[PDB]
Amino acid sequence: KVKLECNPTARIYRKHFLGKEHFNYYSLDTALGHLVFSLKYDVIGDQEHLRLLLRTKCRTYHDVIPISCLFPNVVQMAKLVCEDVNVDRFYPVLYPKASRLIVTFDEHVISNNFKFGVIYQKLGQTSEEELFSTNEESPAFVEFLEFLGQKVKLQDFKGFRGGLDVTHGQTGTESVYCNFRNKEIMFHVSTKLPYTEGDAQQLQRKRHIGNDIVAVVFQDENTPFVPDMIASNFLHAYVVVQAEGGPLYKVSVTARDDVPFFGPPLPDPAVFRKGPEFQEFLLTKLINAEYACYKAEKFAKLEERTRAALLETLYEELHIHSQSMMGLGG
Amino acid sequence: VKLECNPTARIYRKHFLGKEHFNYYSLDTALGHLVFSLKYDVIGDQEHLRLLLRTKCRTYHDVIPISFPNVVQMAKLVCEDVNVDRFYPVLYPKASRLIVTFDEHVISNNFKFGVIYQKLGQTSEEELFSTNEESPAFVEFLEFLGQKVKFRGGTGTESVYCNFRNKEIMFHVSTKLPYTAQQLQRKRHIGNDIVAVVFQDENTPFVPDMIASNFLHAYVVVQAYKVSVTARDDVPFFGPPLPDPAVFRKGPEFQEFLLTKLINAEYACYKAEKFAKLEERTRAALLETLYEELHIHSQSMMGL
Numbered sequence: 001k002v003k004l005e006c007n008p009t010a011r012i013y014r015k016h017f018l019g020k021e022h023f024n025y026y027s028l029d030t031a032l033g034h035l036v037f038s039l040k041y042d043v044i045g046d047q048e049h050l051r052l053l054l055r056t057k058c059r060t061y062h063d064v065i066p067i068s069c070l071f072p073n074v075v076q077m078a079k080l081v082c083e084d085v086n087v088d089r090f091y092p093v094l095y096p097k098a099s100r101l102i103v104t105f106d107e108h109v110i111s112n113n114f115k116f117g118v119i120y121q122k123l124g125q126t127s128e129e130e131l132f133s134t135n136e137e138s139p140a141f142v143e144f145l146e147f148l149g150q151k152v153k154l155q156d157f158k159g160f161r162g163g164l165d166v167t168h169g170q171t172g173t174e175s176v177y178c179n180f181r182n183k184e185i186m187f188h189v190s191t192k193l194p195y196t197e198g199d200a201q202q203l204q205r206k207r208h209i210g211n212d213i214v215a216v217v218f219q220d221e222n223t224p225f226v227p228d229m230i231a232s233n234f235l236h237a238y239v240v241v242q243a244e245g246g247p248l249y250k251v252s253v254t255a256r257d258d259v260p261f262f263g264p265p266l267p268d269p270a271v272f273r274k275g276p277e278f279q280e281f282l283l284t285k286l287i288n289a290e291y292a293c294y295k296a297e298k299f300a301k302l303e304e305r306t307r308a309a310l311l312e313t314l315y316e317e318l319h320i321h322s323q324s325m326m327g328l329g330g
Numbered sequence: 331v332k333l334e335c336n337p338t339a340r341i342y343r344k345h346f347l348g349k350e351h352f353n354y355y356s357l358d359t360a361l362g363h364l365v366f367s368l369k370y371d372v373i374g375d376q377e378h379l380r381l382l383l384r385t386k387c388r389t390y391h392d393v394i395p396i397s398f399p400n401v402v403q404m405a406k407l408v409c410e411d412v413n414v415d416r417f418y419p420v421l422y423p424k425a426s427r428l429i430v431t432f433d434e435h436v437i438s439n440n441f442k443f444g445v446i447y448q449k450l451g452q453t454s455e456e457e458l459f460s461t462n463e464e465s466p467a468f469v470e471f472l473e474f475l476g477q478k479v480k481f482r483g484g485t486g487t488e489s490v491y492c493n494f495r496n497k498e499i500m501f502h503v504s505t506k507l508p509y510t511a512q513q514l515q516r517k518r519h520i521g522n523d524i525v526a527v528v529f530q531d532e533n534t535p536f537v538p539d540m541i542a543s544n545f546l547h548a549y550v551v552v553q554a555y556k557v558s559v560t561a562r563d564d565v566p567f568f569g570p571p572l573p574d575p576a577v578f579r580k581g582p583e584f585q586e587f588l589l590t591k592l593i594n595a596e597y598a599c600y601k602a603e604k605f606a607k608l609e610e611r612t613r614a615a616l617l618e619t620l621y622e623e624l625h626i627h628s629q630s631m632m633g634l
Contacts, residue, residue, distance in 0.1 A: 017334055021348060021426060041423035050423075071423070073631050089632060092419050094401070096370035099350060325401055 025090035033057040046180040095321035115162030117209035132202035149178030161184030237289035258296035263288030354417035363621040422627035444526030459513035547599035568598035
């Protein structure tokens, strides 16, 4: 059904440019930094359009502007999509593999692996101590787990492990996991990870669930749960699922003030029944929560910093190879 | 099994157009203007490169399974004669369109063929053009050739036309055309032609020297059908090979063979010594023009 919430510009090279006639150019802007620019001339009927995608240290800009025989140069096209660009010239990317380097850069922000935690909340529980020290798995809890994904043994598991021990049994003997759209999701199920005699704060469970960004909190009974309940550097958004037996799952979302709105909108009477609709809703909602969390104080810096270094590497390589294309040595 | 037009002329469209490719150009102090097309293409396991090098008379095509080489070397791999300072890149968003047209220009979309009727013994021009009436066997072959109709091909009461690959072809049936001093009104059409069919009711020698035409180079002789081919030492082999029992079964498979052969006959005679000057003259001229356009628009996308 509906597209996953990554930066919507990361798709454009793939849907519109790759495999099709187009041009890439580079240039260095004193303010904007390294520029990597893609442009592509398109025709439908007698309607000549122009699709532009300019990459900066910070953003990539996109637009499709009608052109009409009544033809711009690259500097000028650049200015049509990013007003601030101000550069004497652009340079043609002549390296026959640029487009493969480029798409990878563009897509560096779509992630294919996800790891989410699953905590079970007892009726009274209000502490990490109570929240992780839980051994018995509820009937409702099993039934929900069967629903999230498939149970897998970790011993020789070839899928995405999300940090679990795949070869020595030291992080439980099983987990729940699943292939989603084309993603791999490993769950960190609190009750499936090892329990420790005398370690109330249960490190062997927290070291995984505490390093996740998004978790599901399953409840058998309605109980309060705020993020202030768990001390974590990573946990940012939570999806609470409560099983009113009466077989409806009552669903809610909490996440720090930091994280913006995400995922499929919760339905209006906000309750689901066990089935595909819910599988779809919940899984996309978890992925959307994670993409939303990446906008918060904690991660934004690291993201920026990363985009910048990838772009520079990209720019430098499009530059080195274009040079070797025109006449480095012959 | 395709039509004998220059094979390297279908390639830009089949492989380059609409896919990621690069076009450069240059000024060979020996081969004049140049227009180079190159394309990288990963065939799963192994990576193959494709080249299309244009000169003022030849285009050179080649396909290298490479293991990464610079621009010139890519050129030097298809035409060893290249010797430039540096290739320049086309940056004109509207270039591939100009390039396929140039590449495609030697593909004749139109054909005009002639039908001469040799009455047994007719040996001179005045005679083989004199024939005003049509014999039963000639009409039975003419209605077989294509369909009767009232692409003109440059008149009279009627003539024959037929569609083949998509190309239109009008015939000039001497007899079906107006009768006037040495039949100038039949030579106007059949003369300016290049391939003609000679139909005969009975066998008689036919030889191209029997008609004074600077243009006609080849004839497919059909004798009520015993098909033979006659053409100048100038013109190479063409169309599908002729069959072992040289005869031709009247019908679907025959017409097919014939129409292709006539076409291929023309493309053949276009390789002749009289059809050099116009081929070099046109190709060069067209290239010179395309090089200018490629240059002015590319400079424009940047500097001048």
